[PDB]
Amino acid sequence: EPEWTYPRLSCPGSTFQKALLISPHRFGETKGNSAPLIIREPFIACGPNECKHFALTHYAAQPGGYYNGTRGDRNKLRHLISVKLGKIPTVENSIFHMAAWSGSACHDGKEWTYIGVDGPDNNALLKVKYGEAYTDTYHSYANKILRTQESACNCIGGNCYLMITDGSASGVSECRFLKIREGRIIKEIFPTGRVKHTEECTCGFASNKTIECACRDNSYTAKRPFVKLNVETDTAEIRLMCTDTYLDTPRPNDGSITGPCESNGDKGSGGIKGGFVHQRMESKIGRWYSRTMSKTERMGMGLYVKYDGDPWADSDALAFSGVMVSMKEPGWYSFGFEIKDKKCDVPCIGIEMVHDGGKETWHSAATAIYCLMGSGQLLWDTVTGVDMAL
Amino acid sequence: EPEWTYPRLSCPGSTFQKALLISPHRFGETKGNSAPLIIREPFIACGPNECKHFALTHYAAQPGGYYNGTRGDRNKLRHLISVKLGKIPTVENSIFHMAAWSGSACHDGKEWTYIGVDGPDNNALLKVKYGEAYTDTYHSYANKILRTQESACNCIGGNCYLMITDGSASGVSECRFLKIREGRIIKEIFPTGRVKHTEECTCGFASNKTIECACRDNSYTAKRPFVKLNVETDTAEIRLMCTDTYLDTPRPNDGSITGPCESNGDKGSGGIKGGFVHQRMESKIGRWYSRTMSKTERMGMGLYVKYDGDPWADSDALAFSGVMVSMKEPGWYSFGFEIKDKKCDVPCIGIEMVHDGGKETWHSAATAIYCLMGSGQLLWDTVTGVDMAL
Amino acid sequence: EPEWTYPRLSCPGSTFQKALLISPHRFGETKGNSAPLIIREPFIACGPNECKHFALTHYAAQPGGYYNGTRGDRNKLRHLISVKLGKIPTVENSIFHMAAWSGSACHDGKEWTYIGVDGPDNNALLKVKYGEAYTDTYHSYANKILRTQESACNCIGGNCYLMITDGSASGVSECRFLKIREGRIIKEIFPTGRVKHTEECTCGFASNKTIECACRDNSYTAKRPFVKLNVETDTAEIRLMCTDTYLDTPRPNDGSITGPCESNGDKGSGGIKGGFVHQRMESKIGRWYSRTMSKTERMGMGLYVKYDGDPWADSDALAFSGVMVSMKEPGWYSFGFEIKDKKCDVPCIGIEMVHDGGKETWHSAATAIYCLMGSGQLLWDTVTGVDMAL
Amino acid sequence: EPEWTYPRLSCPGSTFQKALLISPHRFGETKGNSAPLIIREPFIACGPNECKHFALTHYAAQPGGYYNGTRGDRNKLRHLISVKLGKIPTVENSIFHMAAWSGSACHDGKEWTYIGVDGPDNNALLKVKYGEAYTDTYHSYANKILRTQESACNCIGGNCYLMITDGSASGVSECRFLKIREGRIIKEIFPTGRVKHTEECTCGFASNKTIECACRDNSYTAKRPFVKLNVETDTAEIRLMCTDTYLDTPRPNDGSITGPCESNGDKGSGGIKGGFVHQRMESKIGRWYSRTMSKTERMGMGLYVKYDGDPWADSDALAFSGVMVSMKEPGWYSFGFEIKDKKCDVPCIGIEMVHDGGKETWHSAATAIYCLMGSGQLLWDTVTGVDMAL
Ligand SMILES: *[C@@H]1O[C@H](CO)[C@@H](O[C@@H]2O[C@H](CO)[C@@H](O[C@@H]3O[C@H](CO[C@H]4O[C@H](CO)[C@@H](O)[C@H](O)[C@@H]4O)[C@@H](O)[C@H](O)[C@@H]3O)[C@H](O)[C@H]2NC(C)=O)[C@H](O)[C@H]1NC(C)=O
Ligand SMILES: *[C@@H]1O[C@H](CO)[C@@H](O[C@@H]2O[C@H](CO)[C@@H](O[C@@H]3O[C@H](CO[C@H]4O[C@H](CO)[C@@H](O)[C@H](O)[C@@H]4O)[C@@H](O)[C@H](O)[C@@H]3O)[C@H](O)[C@H]2NC(C)=O)[C@H](O)[C@H]1NC(C)=O
Ligand SMILES: *[C@@H]1O[C@H](CO)[C@@H](O[C@@H]2O[C@H](CO)[C@@H](O[C@@H]3O[C@H](CO)[C@@H](O)[C@H](O)[C@@H]3O)[C@H](O)[C@H]2NC(C)=O)[C@H](O)[C@H]1NC(C)=O
Ligand SMILES: *[C@@H]1O[C@H](CO)[C@@H](O[C@@H]2O[C@H](CO)[C@@H](O[C@@H]3O[C@H](CO)[C@@H](O)[C@H](O)[C@@H]3O)[C@H](O)[C@H]2NC(C)=O)[C@H](O)[C@H]1NC(C)=O
Ligand SMILES: *[C@@H]1O[C@H](CO)[C@@H](O[C@@H]2O[C@H](CO)[C@@H](O)[C@H](O)[C@H]2NC(C)=O)[C@H](O)[C@H]1NC(C)=O
Ligand SMILES: *[C@@H]1O[C@H](CO)[C@@H](O[C@@H]2O[C@H](CO)[C@@H](O)[C@H](O)[C@H]2NC(C)=O)[C@H](O)[C@H]1NC(C)=O
Ligand SMILES: CC(=O)N[C@H]1[C@@H]([C@H](O)[C@H](O)CO)OC(C(=O)O)=C[C@@H]1NC(=N)N
Ligand SMILES: CC(=O)N[C@H]1[C@@H]([C@H](O)[C@H](O)CO)OC(C(=O)O)=C[C@@H]1NC(=N)N
Ligand SMILES: CC(=O)N[C@H]1[C@H]([C@H](O)[C@H](O)CO)OC(C(=O)O)=C[C@@H]1NC(=N)N
Ligand SMILES: CC(=O)N[C@H]1[C@H]([C@H](O)[C@H](O)CO)OC(C(=O)O)=C[C@@H]1NC(=N)N
Ligand SMILES: *[C@@H]1O[C@H](CO)[C@@H](O)[C@H](O)[C@H]1NC(C)=O
Ligand SMILES: *[C@@H]1O[C@H](CO)[C@@H](O)[C@H](O)[C@H]1NC(C)=O
Ligand SMILES: [Ca+2]
Ligand SMILES: [Ca+2]
Ligand SMILES: [Ca+2]
Ligand SMILES: [Ca+2]
């Protein structure tokens, strides 16, 4: 008799380590016999028995003849797909959940919820799937590419919370939260505070009372908007992270944005989804983040950590925890997720490593995983191993 | 231990939306490494735990060397196959249930019933398979291509009802209904009324007492024969759908078949299996239908709806719900089906999108799925994304 | 709490029909992207939940580079493999059970028993596998290719009975039966009567007290040795079938072997494994057989039936029940097996259809299935659909 | 609910036989359509319900374009992978557990423990995974390639014991033992005695009180270090195997290392992981070993056995049991493992058969399995059947 899931205390440990590389295009040469799917925006969500590796496919494999368009964001062909984590996401291994050029998913202890956005840019559509069944939708409210998290949503006691946003990518994008229960949207939550532009939130439980999200401002700042969501009152507030360690790409030099914590500063235009995940201890909360090694390119990926504090108020630099992806390798999207051990939760960060050779060739990604395990210092970086000319 | 299933009230909603595209020949290019099966006549049937995607394969894959003959209807190699819905129907993924060039399937709540017709045109044979066991057959009664629904049969209380027919494609084809229980035919039902040509019925539950079917007349009319089958007395009547919105292809202009409801009118020769699904509410019943956008060609697919009334007597046009497949794209067979959610049923329509390059190349199909989903208006159409020269 | 299996009454029906074709090399062209395994001697065995399709592979696929030797019988590479019945036995779908150039398998209600013979011709070795575990062996006793049934063994109340034989293929091959329980050989049974040459027995339950086998004499006669095994006393006796319808290939004209029932007659040299399966009714036993359409070649396959009687004594011709494989198509090995329906057993005959193009090319087989279903007459024959030049 | 597992008495038997060959590169020809993974260091571990086949992959398939580097030992792409035993380790079939260039695994009766070492040579990291959760790590203690067994670890009562080592391949490598429970290291065991070089131990249960291991010394001797680990006091001693039958490769002539048991002798530099498995009977213990047929090259593989005695003190030659792999074929790593039968344990030995074409082509391995099975003498050897030019 399956019960509702709740966030548990995190497992012991004080450092991340390289766990797993999922690099489908290691097998996509013309000399070869495999059919890895062309994908971007991967993320991982785990239930009580299984981990699922999600992505947005372009509905084409490599090698193949439909490369043209695979460097685009949205079209009528993109689908949310998944494999069990640890499987190579090929044509045959994958399962196609729904049409979607923006997605999310989560397990509530009883059943998977799948979330997909599709439709025309000026009138997109959020779709909710619970198990096999399509159960609810939510309409565009600003008529400017309604879109969601591109990472796991979060469930507590059967209630799943999901960030959505709608609005110009170079102007205002006031985000909303949806409270979804058993596939049906039972409440809209309208955040207060600094709501100018929030998107692609990476969200997790700081506790049984609070969800926290580190998001992307693609318009005004290289500081990440940081959401605190009270799950007991269904209220949310947004403020920019204050840390000198700006987590967006592009970004100016750390600590160079002058004025109070709310100051936007320079190099704010553009952005990237950033990894964020909680380490819940008896009396401390650990906050782990990732950002690219380069200040302007999607190259490299570093891990940072800060225990305790108010992310809205602490200007202190984050503690650099190690290089996950070298500056010589691609470092694009990253995301947090949690594996369920028998009695506690294991916090992890996944990294999207995009193979980018321009619009004249195929365009896809690998996925690297780092997880909290043991003590000491982070020891090894991840390479993709792929030569795009093969 | 599993109980029999019964139609339930539908889930809330007032519009369909694009749910899912299964386009396996996106992976069938010569530059690729995949092996999608060559198929036609796909449909979907759902049990308590799982949805299955069925089709009739020509026992060949693309790329391959057995294209010749795949634009034919019947031969000794055609088989009923399936995959879990969301998987691509490939050589390795598919399961082959039985030899068949006409098929159906349904879950009674305990077990799958598979239905496959094959044999010679003048003496074909319907075969029943219950799980893994072949359990029963039914013989041609007119010696002119015994054939069945090409979509899910319907179970209630362990009783599964199935349309069969026999007779000339261009003359009389009096259908019958088989009542089937745990794989064995226990009753034949002889419909009453307008009985001279009924084939390829798409059937569903109007309630716990009635099954309704919208069918194809390939010979006499562009109106669809409309079956009402009483499940409490095991009796059935057929009359032509009265609606001005003629659902066959080909068909004349809407409302142009003059005279009383049973008038056949012109452009009646030829036809196509149409989508039909029920939206069951407490105090009213919604009927959803699909037809091609072209009045003569198998191009496009539009969605229509009417609430309540009697389809035998009401001439009112169906309300246009939206374009599922634009007229630039192929729109062949369509079928109804329902997904079992936790406490209600989700009504859906699937669309066969045939890749037709003539008899000089391969001939197969993609499948699009639209489902009842939230409110508002239908928002996006479907394309297969397939170039047949690849 | 799984219980021991017993033979049950057969399901109703009075004729066989074409059920299923498994034709892996429909997908093995150079133009294609699949990897069907090169196999011969298929057979099927069913447990209470699943049907398994077994074969002896040459550990090579098509297309591939190891064709040379695939027209041989024995080597160090042959393995017993299986897939779930209904799956194409490819490199990836198959599972490799054990090294074997001769095999059998059966389910006892609790667990699969797998049986494989390998080793040098003059000192071969029967190996028994119960589930994952290798559990017992049995040595050559005549030092002339110890070999087994190439079809399902038979289990009652946890005891599995298996025919084995050892001896020259052009002289004496006194067979033995092994009683195997939970993977261990607990008794040898030495048949009496006509024991000169028995091999490749196709065996089944005539009742709870008796196993019957129709076997192959590759040396002295075109009559099939016919075994009756008393399961309650563990005693077996062998006599030639008496029917005018000689079931071996090659064979003289029916009814042309003069003298008493035991007379060997002409064209006795050579042979073929023949399908045989029981139809158990309340007071009748039905016996179904298959033999090639040609009297001298492995071409075509016909179905025969006789109700009741003593196969040792009745000279009456068997009743011809229909053409399963045309004389224009290959008809090699055939075998009986039974599917388990919910409350009764479904008798079936499988047919090996070998693609034979000589030693200069690849050498493999398809499998066709006919099962007892409904009434009337057998309606359609099976073709393989394969062009070996592709 | 599942109970912890404990070594049981072995099943009856007095000889090994050829059981199974896993030769995936039989499907790796350029004329083919398959994608076997490039792997080395395979081993097998069995739980209550299933046997798993593990290897270290170079994250590449054959045919492919990443052959370069697959004859190297360590890199950032190597992963621990597995399939169900009897499946071919291909891109689609394999599951990727974690990044590792050194590995182990074992089932405690409730769950799988996976072990993978990676990171830089001077600072490598052992990672523990319990089911799907990363649960613990252990750091290099000598900064000279921390590494582990390359074969199954051993569990008793929920306690899993694992050999690790660290130090120069050509100097001192003092191993340790990790006691692991539900994924977390709870004790380090520091062996006593002849401790200067111990690596790649093949371990099994001599009883409920003792684990024994036959290990590799790559530096000093051709005798195998022999670990006795007491599981009741968690203490361990290592001495050199005294037997005249030296089990390493390279090695001098048998019995030619003069002097007392702990004498190292000549040709000690270099080495190879050897097969070792226990045959536990009521009143006696059988120890089965394997070594290459060549005294210097990794060619061939022979089987040896001794009952009882003390391997630290007895100089008696082991009894030659037979040739598993002829000297014409490659014989690289060998490993012990046990299959769980219903009431007893089946001892087995696996053999890595490496396809070595030098560094100018691909580099990978097949796996042969021999098992305790009936009585008599071992009857057949194994060949891979693979031509590397294809
Ligand atoms: C067609 O007929 C079907 C069979 O009569 C109808 O299904 C029945 O629907 C009613 C209400 O919609 C259900 O009664 C409710 O039961 C729930 C609890 O559900 C379970 O209860 C126990 C477990 O405690 C279990 O034994 C049952 O089998 C249910 O799984 C209560 O909370 C409600 O208060 C109410 O009593 C019936 O259970 C259900 N029967 C079956 C066999 O499914 C169906 O509604 C009809 N379709 C229509 C009208 O369109
Ligand atoms: C190492 O220690 C292990 C744990 O002490 C030993 O395993 C034990 O072995 C004994 C006999 O070999 C078993 O006792 C027998 O039990 C069977 C019935 O088996 C089941 O009984 C009940 C169900 O009725 C269930 O609760 C149990 O868990 C068993 O599954 C009886 O028929 C016999 O008469 C006898 O009592 C123990 O059950 C078994 N324990 C465990 C935990 O497996 C093992 O033998 C030792 N290894 C050696 C000595 O080499
Ligand atoms: C968030 O809230 C959930 C639900 O309240 C917390 O889960 C609950 O955790 C407690 C203690 O960890 C569990 O209580 C029980 O305690 C006894 C020991 O006396 C033990 O034998 C039981 O097996 C169990 O551990 C309770 O079962 C559990 N409930 C659920 C539904 O999971 C969770 O710990 C909270 N997260 C925090 C505080 O970070
Ligand atoms: C061969 O022997 C087996 C074992 O004796 C026979 O199976 C047994 O069949 C009987 C009757 O079919 C089963 O008895 C029970 O009868 C009541 C009706 O009063 C019914 O409610 C039960 O569910 C069951 O049918 C018995 O359970 C069953 N036992 C086993 C272990 O299967 C089998 O019928 C014999 N085959 C023949 C005679 O051909
Ligand atoms: C496709 O198959 C059909 C029949 O299966 C082929 O038709 C035959 O063509 C030859 C000439 O090439 C005629 O002599 C036969 O009489 C035809 N048979 C039938 C039944 O029509 C056809 O040639 C094939 N097409 C291709 C391109 O190979
Ligand atoms: C295999 O890979 C190695 C290194 O990964 C290649 O070695 C390099 O070769 C170039 C010349 O072609 C040298 O300039 C580099 O210094 C070498 N690097 C190292 C690390 O040795 C090697 O060429 C590759 N082999 C093939 C056949 O491509
Ligand atoms: C049994 C059979 O062959 N049915 C045909 C065909 C049919 O001839 C018409 O319905 C007229 O009776 O309709 C459709 C069609 O595309 O029109 C293909 C079907 N293909 C198959 N289901 N195989
Ligand atoms: C950790 C590691 O790299 N072990 C090596 C190698 C090793 O260097 C020796 O044991 C000496 O210490 O042995 C064998 C070998 O073939 O000799 C390959 C191993 N390959 C790997 N397991 N990756
Ligand atoms: C198109 C869309 O819905 N999301 C975009 C996203 C976007 O343009 C920015 O966040 C601005 O709002 O940018 C990223 C990106 O790589 O920068 C790709 C995303 N692609 C998809 N998720 N498909
Ligand atoms: C080699 C062996 O063990 N059995 C042979 C079998 C045999 O030669 C005759 O039965 C005579 O005894 O003939 C048949 C055959 O096709 O005629 C192939 C079998 N091939 C295999 N089962 N592999
Ligand atoms: C493919 O490239 C051609 C090049 O002219 C362009 O016209 C077309 O729009 C591209 N298709 C897609 C789907 O991007
Ligand atoms: C392959 O054919 C060659 C041709 O001369 C022959 O020498 C060899 O024995 C054959 N191999 C096998 C395995 O039959
Ligand atoms: Ca920004
Ligand atoms: Ca018509
Ligand atoms: Ca003969
Ligand atoms: Ca050595």
Kindly state the tokens that stand for A287: 């906050």
Strands (E) in D231-272, as ranges, are 235-240
Amino acid identity, position D268 = G
Range of the domain at A274: 1-390
Amino acid identity, position A221 = T
Report the Cα B48 to chain-centroid distance in Å: 20
- Contact present, A103 and A150 (Cβ < 8 Å): yes
Which residues in chain B have Cβ-Cβ distances shorter than 8 Å to A95? 84, 86-87
Q: Which of A308, A304, A311 is CA-nearest to residue A290?
A: A304
Domain count, chain D: 1
CA of D299 to the centre of ligand 10 (A): 33
Q: Which of C202, D371, C108, C124 is CA-nearest to residue C116?
A: C124
Kindly state the tokens that stand for A187: 């409440």
Of C64, C97, C137, the CB nearest to D17: C137
Q: Exactly one of D6, D73, D341, D387 is catalytic; which is it?
A: D73
- Contact present, C68 and C45 (Cβ < 8 Å): no
Q: Which of A63, C29, C65 is CA-nearest to residue D31?
A: C65
Q: Is B147 exposed, middle or buried (0-12, 13-18, 19+ CB in 10 A)?
A: buried
CATH (domain of D22): 2.120.10.10
Which residues in chain D have Cβ-Cβ distances shorter than 8 Å to A18? 99, 118-119
Which residues, 6 or more positions from A363, have their beta carbon under 8 angstroms from its beta carbon? Answer: A38, A40, A67, A70, A71, A354, A355, A356, A357
Cβ distance D26 to C60 less than 8 Å, yes or no, reads yes
Q: What is the four-CA torsion angle of B53, B54, B57, B61, rounded to 10 degrees?
A: 10
Of D32, D93, D381, the CB nearest to C35: D32
Amino acid identity, position B236 = A
Print the SS3 string covering D231-242. CCCCEEEEEECC
Q: Exactly one of A138, A161, A333, A370 is catalytic; which is it?
A: A333
Kindly state the tokens that stand for A357: 């050779």
How far, in Å, CA of B343 to CA of A220, rounded? 46
Print the SS3 string covering chain A. CCCCCCCCCECCECCEEEEEEECHHHHCCCCCCCCEEEEEEEEEEECCCCEEEEEEEEEEECCCCCCCCCCCCCCCCCEEEEEECCCCCECCCCEEEEECCEEEEEECCCCEEEEEEECCHHHCEEEEEECCEEEEEEECCCCCCCEECCCCCEEECCEEEEEEECCCCCCCECEEEEEEECCEEEEEECCEECCCECEEEEEEECCCCEEEEEEECCCCCCCCEEEEEECCCCEEEEEECCCCCCCCCCCCCCCCCCCCCCCCCCCCCCCCCCCEEEEECCCCEEEEEEECCCCCCCEEEEEEEEECCCCCCCCCCCEEEEEEEEEEEECCCEEEEEEECCCCEEEEEEEEEEEECCCCCCEEEEEEEEEECECCCCCCCCCCCCCCCC
Amino acid identity, position A350 = G
Give chain A's radius of gyration (CA, Å).
19
A 10 A CB-CB count for A95 gives 18
Which residues, 6 or more positions from A120, have their beta carbon under 8 angstroms from its beta carbon? Answer: B379, B380
Backbone phi and psi for residue C95, each to the nearest 5 degrees, phi listed first:
-125, 140
Give chain C's radius of gyration (CA, Å).
19
Ligand nearest to the CA of D4: 2
Backbone phi and psi for residue C123, each to the nearest 5 degrees, phi listed first:
-170, 55
Of D120, D132, D183, the CB nearest to A380: D120
Backbone phi and psi for residue A33, each to the nearest 5 degrees, phi listed first:
-135, 20
Distance from CA of A170 to the nearest CA of D (A): 39
Q: What is the four-CA torsion angle of A85, A88, A94, A100, rounded to 10 degrees?
A: 80
User: What residues form DSSP beta bridges with A368?
Assistant: A21, A351
Which residues in chain B have Cβ-Cβ distances shorter than 8 Å to C31? 63-65
- Contact present, C332 and C350 (Cβ < 8 Å): no
Give chain B's radius of gyration (CA, Å).
19
Q: Which of C374, C51, C372, C9 is CA-nearest to residue B180?
A: C374
Q: Report DSSP state, residue C197.
A: B
How far, in Å, CA of A99 to CA of B373, rounded? 13
Cβ distance D387 to C65 less than 8 Å, yes or no, reads yes
For residue C60, give the 3-state DSSP assignment. strand
Which residues, 6 or more positions from B271, have their beta carbon under 8 angstroms from its beta carbon? Answer: B199, B216, B217, B218, B219, B222, B248, B249, B250
- Is any ligand 8 atom within 6 A of the Cβ of residue D218? yes
Task: Enter the resolution in angstroms.
Answer: 2.4
Q: Is D269 exposed, middle or buried (0-12, 13-18, 19+ CB in 10 A)?
A: middle
- Contact present, B137 and B164 (Cβ < 8 Å): no
As for ligand 10, residues whose beta carbon falls within 6 Å of it are C 41, 56, 73-74, 101-102, 145, 147, 150, 169, 199-200, 218
CA of C216 to the centre of ligand 15 (A): 6
Residue written as token pair 């997880």: A371
| Chains contacting A (3+ CB pairs below 8 angstroms) | B, D
A161 counts as catalytic: no
User: What residues form DSSP beta bridges with D374?
Assistant: D13
Backbone phi and psi for residue A144, each to the nearest 5 degrees, phi listed first:
-140, 80
Distance from CA of C200 to the nearest CA of D (A): 23
Kindly state the tokens that stand for A217: 């401002």
Give chain D's radius of gyration (CA, Å).
19
Amino acid identity, position C186 = I
Report the Cα C136 to chain-centroid distance in Å: 23
A 10 A CB-CB count for D280 gives 21
Residue written as token pair 């700006």: A246
- Is any ligand 1 atom within 6 A of the Cβ of residue B170? no
Q: Best substitution site from B4, B6, B231, B284 to test ligand 1's pocket, by max atoms within 8 Å of Cβ? A: B6
CA separation, residue A259 to residues A58, A165, A238, A242, A315 (Å): 44, 28, 19, 11, 11
The minimum-distance atom of ligand 9 relative to the CA of A271 is 17
How far, in Å, CA of C139 to CA of D376, rounded? 8
How far, in Å, CA of A72 to CA of A75, rounded? 8
- Contact present, B254 and B245 (Cβ < 8 Å): yes
Distance from CA of C99 to the nearest CA of D (A): 5
Q: Report DSSP state, residue C13.
A: B
Q: Which of D353, D380, D378 is CA-nearest to residue D367?
A: D353
Cβ distance A138 to B374 less than 8 Å, yes or no, reads yes
Amino acid identity, position C145 = I
Which residues in chain B have Cβ-Cβ distances shorter than 8 Å to C340? 132-133
Q: Is D254 exposed, middle or buried (0-12, 13-18, 19+ CB in 10 A)?
A: middle
Cβ distance C61 to D90 less than 8 Å, yes or no, reads no
Kindly state the tokens that stand for B104: 């159906």
For residue C168, give the 3-state DSSP assignment. coil
How far, in Å, CA of A235 to CA of A232, rounded? 8
CA of A101 to the centre of ligand 11 (A): 19
Q: Per-residue DSSP letters for C76-142?
A: TT-EEEEEETTS--BTTT-EEEEE-SEEEEEE-SS-EEEEEEES-GGG-EEEEEETTEEEEEEE-SS
Which residue in A80, A132, A141, A146 has the most chain B C-beta atoms within 10 A of its own C-beta, making it the best mutation to test that interface?
A132
Q: Exactly one of D166, D333, D370, D381 is catalytic; which is it?
A: D333
Q: What is the four-CA torsion angle of D41, D47, D49, D52, rounded to 10 degrees?
A: -10
Residue written as token pair 């619009």: A359
Q: Which of A37, A149, A138 is CA-nearest to residue A93?
A: A37
User: What residues form DSSP beta bridges with D339?
Assistant: D346
Q: Report DSSP state, residue C294.
A: S
Kindly state the tokens that stand for D152: 């199954």
- Contact present, B50 and B75 (Cβ < 8 Å): no
Distance from CA of A89 to the nearest CA of B (A): 12
The minimum-distance atom of ligand 4 relative to the CA of C3 is 31
For residue C160, give the 3-state DSSP assignment. strand
- Is any ligand 1 atom within 6 A of the Cβ of residue B307? no
Which residues, 6 or more positions from C216, have their beta carbon under 8 angstroms from its beta carbon? Answer: C198, C199, C200, C201, C224, C225, C248, C271, C272, C273, C274
Q: Best substitution site from B147, B224, B334 to test ligand 7's pocket, by max atoms within 8 Å of Cβ? A: B147
How far, in Å, CA of A129 to CA of A132, rounded? 7
